[PDB]
Amino acid sequence: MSSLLNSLLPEYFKPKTNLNINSSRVQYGFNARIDMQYEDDSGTRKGSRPNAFMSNTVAFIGNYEGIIVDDIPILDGLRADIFDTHGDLDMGLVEDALSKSTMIRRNVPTYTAYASELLYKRNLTSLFYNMLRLYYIKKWGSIKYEKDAIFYDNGHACLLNRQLFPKSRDASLESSLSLPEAEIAMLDPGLEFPEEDVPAILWHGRVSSRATCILGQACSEFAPLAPFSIAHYSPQLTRKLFVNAPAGIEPSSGRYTHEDVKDAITILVSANQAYTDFEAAYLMLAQTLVSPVPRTAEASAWFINAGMVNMPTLSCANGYYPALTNVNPYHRLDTWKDTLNHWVAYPDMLFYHSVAMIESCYVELGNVARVSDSDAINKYTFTELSVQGRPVMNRGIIVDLTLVAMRTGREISLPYPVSCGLTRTDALLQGTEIHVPVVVKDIDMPQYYNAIDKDVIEGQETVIKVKQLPPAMYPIYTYGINTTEFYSDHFEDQVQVEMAPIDNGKAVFNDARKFSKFMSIMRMMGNDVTATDLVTGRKVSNWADNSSGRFLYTDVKYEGQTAFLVDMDTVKARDHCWVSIVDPNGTMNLSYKMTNFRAAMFSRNKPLYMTGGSVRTIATGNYRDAAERLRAMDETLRLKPFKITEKLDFRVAAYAIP
Amino acid sequence: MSSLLNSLLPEYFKPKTNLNINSSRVQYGFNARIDMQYEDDSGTRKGSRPNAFMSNTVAFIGNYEGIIVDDIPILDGLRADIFDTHGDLDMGLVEDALSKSTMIRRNVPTYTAYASELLYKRNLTSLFYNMLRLYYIKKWGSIKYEKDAIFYDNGHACLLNRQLFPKSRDASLESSLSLPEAEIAMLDPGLEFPEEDVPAILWHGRVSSRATCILGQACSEFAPLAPFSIAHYSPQLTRKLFVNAPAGIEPSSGRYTHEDVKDAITILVSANQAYTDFEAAYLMLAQTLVSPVPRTAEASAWFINAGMVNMPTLSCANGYYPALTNVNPYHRLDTWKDTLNHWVAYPDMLFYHSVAMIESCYVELGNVARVSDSDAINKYTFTELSVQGRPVMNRGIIVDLTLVAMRTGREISLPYPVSCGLTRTDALLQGTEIHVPVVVKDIDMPQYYNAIDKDVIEGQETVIKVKQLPPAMYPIYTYGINTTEFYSDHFEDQVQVEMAPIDNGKAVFNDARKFSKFMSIMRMMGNDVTATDLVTGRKVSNWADNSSGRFLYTDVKYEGQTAFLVDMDTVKARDHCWVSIVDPNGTMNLSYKMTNFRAAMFSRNKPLYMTGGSVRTIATGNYRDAAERLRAMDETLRLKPFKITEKLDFRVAAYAIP
Amino acid sequence: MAPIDNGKAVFNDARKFSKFMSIMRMMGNDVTATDLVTGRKVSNWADNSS
């Protein structure tokens, strides 16, 4: 769904057609200008940060596994006459439709019996999913995965790719997969009984020598060596695949270019009228394509256990009964060919749509994790209250699109309630502390991180405990579309806090909200302050994340209640503007303004520049030549948003109906 | 009748087409949120179970035996001209109709004489019944039956499959039957005198190679090895079967799929004009598709002796008189094709219609068994007063439909008073003791159950004496639509047990009604209560079921005087998500509230999900409006043009609609 | 208090700490609080008269 994911990008940013990705890691952000103004009891001070880079990091590494499941049928492309006055498939009219379009009327009773059983299981989403993955393996087939490389690196702790991904070796993306080929047989017209558990698809003219090899490899098993996002393990779709081609198919060549896969997809969709089936596969890949690099070491807990990708079962009966597919197809929405028309024009745009989607999900799960398990809307019952359709199960895409609705605060709508794709909320839905394996870089590691072994040596491999899941990403593209108090991602804001009395060289902050505001100010001024949690006896630091220049309360790494002892004597000066002061006095007022946003992308510690021309808009209106909006709002999936209502605690988040 | 069985299903239940059954046991039910409360002089203790599963276990096994009986003729199908004003065959118009036809002139006088006997032989219910069973045998053929498997187990008593079903070998449903084929001869139109005691049917065009194999096996003896419900014992319907098909009958293929049986049925109903015959066969199979696993150990008395199935004799004389069947048939009700049209569209919906019917019957036979013989509407005379027709004998479908009418509280209407199918009320009407076999687990069994021995070592085969039949199923689909105080299936309920501090926990229940509600609500709260009768000296436990989680008064297994001593310092916490009664003092007040309902099904201790399209309520009007429409768009290939439009680039072309 | 906290409560206010410790003694409960800054201990049972 192009028009949906295209809306998530910020109004100022309009990306160009091509993007030459040449690495397994891409930073994306913006260069903003901050105009700070400070006032306290001592006096006033005015400064200005001329260039500030706020960015996340996203990679092409994510452990996933495929399962074949049975899902709903997509009834789009079938002729409009077989459907009655309502949006329902009548078997009374299928008998009539097949009868009028043949001379041999002996086969009508047999044809109707088989058609009735097959039409209620038609889904080509799993075939297009694999065909799309083959396109990007050939295009970006020069990305290197080194086993003894770094995953996260702060200075105290470190995670290698040996950990998080065991049973892996060093390989390029083209060298990862060695796909076998399934038998692409020809369906001779005259066969009366459709062979069971084998799909048949239509084709335009002669099946090319290259087109055979693509369809053969798309249906086969995926068995990777290196952990890659677009080369994840998938079960075998089918053994055989019939093709009702008037001209006979040619034998498989063995080799194909990425350009040849586009020609295979464009023909397969046009012949079968499977435009809505492609839209499902497009959204399903937008989830998987890229995975987040964690903000802090604790945010690696999300990516330990392998998330399951629900691939629908491959079934189709267009090859057997080509009478059912004619020139007047049935569609629910009039904008039902937009997603394919967008991809075929601008293939590399999927990267930006993928980054936009996975950001929105992992940002909002930062809030859902902090919700107490004694309210109406909680981690267990947030999807069920949101959805207003009838899917098979609240899994895959339904979970992800619910989180996008909660982020943007708008009603998202799909034509069919499809439940296919990655489920992320697995690490969240379990009342157990997660054991992230880490490497010790400095001797003073146990003071900061909640480590098992309290005495360590540089080189030792230990384990750290994570109870509450912290935010994996900070808002960048979705910055200021709706501002929560937790992130505090405002354009303009006036922070007011009262400074605690400095007894010896230490200031006690008993309250939780005041402590968050204090360290948030001192960070924007650019003062590396270090405080001691009195309950646990572990040191917290506002400079936890360098990439995103902000302080979240989850950097304390202790759910519950505590009091902090801030060290006011050892306040280091890392980055100093003219605003920056060391000695606060009385009531601290900081008023900042953010202006002059401009998007910038970094890859392999150099600037990554966009190539090609400017993207012209392709989009169809609500009506072509349709008079009355026959609402048909019974079967269509609808996802209602939730607004965060702030309360006194500040540690707990709460959702309400707007 | 699809219509009346559809209304039995709950409001929240939204069924889909396909149901992938892969076992011989299904736990259908619903998930509800129970808000329990315990109020006392000391204070209130609140609990909340967010997902409480109330289930009824249903199996695919059950001993049945078919017998060929004489039943009324179904006159729906014959041309409307030969019928008089009253609605009976006016012989004289038959002789007129045969004379003005395409019949051989020398046969008219001899055939007209036979008409008086042969035209009143119209009942195809037996053939359609067997052909429907062949459809489901080949569809769900992979289900297994093990000999030494657990039929029932409640901890104390165990009942194996060897006990109830001797002469039983372990085998799959597909490998159970080995059906021999009956002769399908071609009717010679130039036959001198019609052969009575040999049925002759009509057919459209040519009898296919697979249709011969299906009709051959349908009119044959069912001799099963494993006691399956859809493969029970049936006698040989007929030896030979004539088929008036001018196009010759092809010889038997040998093999056929489940889709080929649907092809055979749709041709047979259409040619013979026998829709009311199919409606009778649909309701017959709805009774005897699935049998309920007994709720308690002593509720196995219903399934000891084999209940007889009444199959009406196969008799059809359409082959001899082709002229009398045409396109203008005589029918009583206008909605006479609705039952077939429903089955062809949604075959797997019969499973839901079957469980709805047996749950309605076995619930009502529960509270019919607890009435004294000295009454107006009693055990023996509950069918006679309800029935306002003229059936041959009050058996089969009449006894099952009258029990459904009592449950729902509505008027059930059928077009013909047909008396065919299973008779359930067999063990009830006998009014004698039934001896169910049991294998013991513990050594302290015969205190609880009314056993034949008083001391029994573990692993011994004993006998339980059941006098009054307890309810076999708890109401789940019919929950709080026609509520009785016996089952106590309310949304809101409360009980007030009155105790004084002078009593050291010990309470005596003089009333029987509130004893039942106390013991039931304590089990929702997850507390194992063990009462002891003061008069007799037996013991009862509220934990006497692992499906519903309720206490019915028939679990006492004795009718006498009510003096139940419950000691409230021996209450043990058994389940999870439970409220604790540590030490009560004064008057106790228990209460619960069920708020929302969600349909759930379980199989092999895993969730069984419904897949496929959205099932609609098919009406007679929804198809015949498309017949009124006719697709009246004159079938004329009108090709509309597209004017090319030039813009800035001129290299690429752009087409407009006008 | 929230369920995420495993029984442990921090009294930032001095006024309601006094009323909590006092009413718990009427109810016959021996509470022993510990100050986080200094590291001393206080017990509500510090009298046998009032």
PDB file of all heavy atoms in Angstrom, chain A residues 71-73 109 113 116 120 392, chain B residues 259 263 345 610-613 622, unseen atoms left out:
ATOM      1  N   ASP A  71      -4.924 -18.883   5.143  1.00  0.00           N
ATOM      2  CA  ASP A  71      -5.468 -17.511   5.342  1.00  0.00           C
ATOM      3  C   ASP A  71      -6.728 -17.353   4.474  1.00  0.00           C
ATOM      4  O   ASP A  71      -7.117 -18.340   3.817  1.00  0.00           O
ATOM      5  N   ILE A  72      -7.345 -16.165   4.483  1.00  0.00           N
ATOM      6  CA  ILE A  72      -8.602 -15.848   3.735  1.00  0.00           C
ATOM      7  C   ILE A  72      -8.299 -15.818   2.236  1.00  0.00           C
ATOM      8  O   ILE A  72      -7.159 -15.578   1.842  1.00  0.00           O
ATOM      9  N   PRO A  73      -9.303 -16.057   1.359  1.00  0.00           N
ATOM     10  CA  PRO A  73      -9.145 -15.841  -0.080  1.00  0.00           C
ATOM     11  C   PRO A  73      -9.344 -14.370  -0.477  1.00  0.00           C
ATOM     12  O   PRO A  73     -10.233 -13.734   0.067  1.00  0.00           O
ATOM     13  N   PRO A 109     -21.336 -29.672 -15.201  1.00  0.00           N
ATOM     14  CA  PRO A 109     -21.555 -30.224 -13.859  1.00  0.00           C
ATOM     15  C   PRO A 109     -20.270 -30.556 -13.080  1.00  0.00           C
ATOM     16  O   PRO A 109     -20.243 -30.309 -11.886  1.00  0.00           O
ATOM     17  N   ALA A 113     -18.400 -28.259  -9.643  1.00  0.00           N
ATOM     18  CA  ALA A 113     -18.128 -29.009  -8.392  1.00  0.00           C
ATOM     19  C   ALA A 113     -16.715 -28.704  -7.875  1.00  0.00           C
ATOM     20  O   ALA A 113     -16.573 -28.472  -6.659  1.00  0.00           O
ATOM     21  N   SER A 116     -16.101 -24.711  -6.962  1.00  0.00           N
ATOM     22  CA  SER A 116     -16.728 -24.343  -5.663  1.00  0.00           C
ATOM     23  C   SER A 116     -15.757 -24.578  -4.495  1.00  0.00           C
ATOM     24  O   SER A 116     -15.813 -23.800  -3.524  1.00  0.00           O
ATOM     25  N   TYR A 120     -12.543 -20.601  -2.873  1.00  0.00           N
ATOM     26  CA  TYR A 120     -12.493 -20.158  -1.451  1.00  0.00           C
ATOM     27  C   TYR A 120     -11.076 -20.301  -0.867  1.00  0.00           C
ATOM     28  O   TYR A 120     -10.896 -19.926   0.309  1.00  0.00           O
ATOM     29  N   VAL A 392      -8.643 -14.105  10.454  1.00  0.00           N
ATOM     30  CA  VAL A 392      -8.449 -15.488  10.989  1.00  0.00           C
ATOM     31  C   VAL A 392      -7.869 -15.384  12.405  1.00  0.00           C
ATOM     32  O   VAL A 392      -8.376 -16.084  13.303  1.00  0.00           O
TER      33      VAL A 392
ATOM     34  N   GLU B 259     -14.829 -34.433  -4.463  1.00  0.00           N
ATOM     35  CA  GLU B 259     -15.428 -33.427  -5.387  1.00  0.00           C
ATOM     36  C   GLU B 259     -16.344 -34.120  -6.409  1.00  0.00           C
ATOM     37  O   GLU B 259     -17.310 -33.471  -6.855  1.00  0.00           O
ATOM     38  N   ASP B 263     -20.624 -33.739  -7.613  1.00  0.00           N
ATOM     39  CA  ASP B 263     -21.031 -33.768  -9.046  1.00  0.00           C
ATOM     40  C   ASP B 263     -22.187 -34.758  -9.235  1.00  0.00           C
ATOM     41  O   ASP B 263     -23.135 -34.416  -9.971  1.00  0.00           O
ATOM     42  N   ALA B 345     -22.765 -24.743  -1.598  1.00  0.00           N
ATOM     43  CA  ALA B 345     -21.949 -23.534  -1.329  1.00  0.00           C
ATOM     44  C   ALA B 345     -20.993 -23.791  -0.157  1.00  0.00           C
ATOM     45  O   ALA B 345     -19.779 -23.554  -0.331  1.00  0.00           O
ATOM     46  N   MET B 610     -10.752 -21.262  12.192  1.00  0.00           N
ATOM     47  CA  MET B 610     -11.647 -21.278  11.003  1.00  0.00           C
ATOM     48  C   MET B 610     -11.000 -20.441   9.896  1.00  0.00           C
ATOM     49  O   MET B 610     -10.553 -19.314  10.198  1.00  0.00           O
ATOM     50  N   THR B 611     -10.951 -20.975   8.670  1.00  0.00           N
ATOM     51  CA  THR B 611     -10.319 -20.350   7.475  1.00  0.00           C
ATOM     52  C   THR B 611     -11.343 -20.269   6.337  1.00  0.00           C
ATOM     53  O   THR B 611     -12.440 -20.847   6.485  1.00  0.00           O
ATOM     54  N   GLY B 612     -10.989 -19.578   5.248  1.00  0.00           N
ATOM     55  CA  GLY B 612     -11.815 -19.434   4.033  1.00  0.00           C
ATOM     56  C   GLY B 612     -12.611 -18.141   4.027  1.00  0.00           C
ATOM     57  O   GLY B 612     -12.240 -17.208   4.772  1.00  0.00           O
ATOM     58  N   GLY B 613     -13.670 -18.084   3.212  1.00  0.00           N
ATOM     59  CA  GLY B 613     -14.515 -16.890   3.008  1.00  0.00           C
ATOM     60  C   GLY B 613     -15.510 -16.686   4.139  1.00  0.00           C
ATOM     61  O   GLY B 613     -15.587 -17.556   5.030  1.00  0.00           O
ATOM     62  N   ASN B 622     -32.055 -13.866  -3.197  1.00  0.00           N
ATOM     63  CA  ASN B 622     -30.685 -13.367  -3.511  1.00  0.00           C
ATOM     64  C   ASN B 622     -30.190 -13.907  -4.864  1.00  0.00           C
ATOM     65  O   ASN B 622     -29.359 -13.214  -5.484  1.00  0.00           O
TER      66      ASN B 622
END
